Coordinates of N, CA, C and O in Angstrom, one line a residue:
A1 N 14.3 -32.0 9.9 CA 13.9 -32.1 12.1 C 13.0 -31.3 11.4 O 12.4 -31.3 13.2
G2 N 11.8 -31.6 11.3 CA 10.9 -31.4 10.5 C 10.0 -32.3 10.0 O 8.9 -32.4 9.0
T3 N 10.5 -33.3 9.6 CA 9.6 -34.5 8.9 C 9.3 -35.8 10.2 O 7.9 -35.8 10.7
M4 N 10.1 -36.7 10.2 CA 9.9 -37.2 12.1 C 10.6 -35.9 12.4 O 11.8 -35.4 12.0
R5 N 10.6 -34.8 13.7 CA 11.7 -34.3 14.8 C 12.9 -35.1 15.2 O 12.6 -36.3 15.3
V6 N 14.1 -34.5 15.3 CA 15.6 -35.0 15.9 C 14.7 -35.8 17.0 O 14.4 -35.4 18.3
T7 N 15.7 -37.1 16.7 CA 15.2 -38.5 18.9 C 16.5 -38.7 19.2 O 17.9 -38.5 18.4
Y8 N 16.4 -38.7 20.4 CA 17.5 -39.0 20.9 C 17.7 -39.8 22.5 O 16.3 -39.4 23.3
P9 N 18.2 -40.6 23.5 CA 18.5 -41.5 24.5 C 19.1 -40.7 25.1 O 19.0 -40.8 27.0
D10 N 18.2 -39.0 25.4 CA 18.1 -38.4 26.5 C 17.1 -37.3 26.8 O 16.4 -36.9 25.9
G11 N 18.1 -36.1 27.5 CA 17.9 -34.9 27.4 C 19.4 -34.0 26.7 O 18.7 -34.7 25.5
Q12 N 19.9 -33.8 26.9 CA 21.2 -32.6 25.6 C 22.3 -34.4 25.0 O 22.8 -34.5 26.1
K13 N 21.6 -34.7 24.4 CA 22.5 -36.0 23.2 C 22.3 -36.3 21.7 O 21.6 -37.3 21.6
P14 N 22.8 -35.2 21.9 CA 23.0 -35.2 20.0 C 24.2 -36.0 20.0 O 25.0 -36.7 20.4
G15 N 24.1 -35.8 18.3 CA 25.7 -36.8 17.6 C 25.6 -38.3 17.7 O 26.3 -38.6 16.7
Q16 N 24.7 -38.6 18.6 CA 24.0 -40.8 18.6 C 22.7 -40.9 19.3 O 22.5 -39.8 20.0
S17 N 22.1 -40.7 17.6 CA 20.5 -39.6 18.2 C 20.2 -40.6 16.3 O 20.0 -41.7 16.6
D18 N 18.5 -40.5 16.6 CA 17.7 -40.9 15.9 C 17.4 -40.3 14.8 O 17.5 -40.5 13.3
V19 N 18.0 -38.8 14.4 CA 18.0 -38.3 13.3 C 18.2 -36.6 13.2 O 17.3 -35.7 13.5
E20 N 19.6 -36.3 13.1 CA 19.7 -35.0 13.8 C 19.6 -33.3 12.0 O 18.8 -32.4 12.5
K21 N 19.4 -33.7 11.5 CA 18.1 -33.4 10.7 C 17.4 -34.6 9.4 O 18.2 -34.9 8.7
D22 N 16.2 -34.5 9.4 CA 15.2 -34.7 8.2 C 15.0 -33.6 7.3 O 15.3 -32.4 6.4

């Protein structure tokens, strides 16, 4: 989460997402 960092379609929105760990 430090190559790209984690991305998501809101605020508090993990689990269906851009990348929870790079």
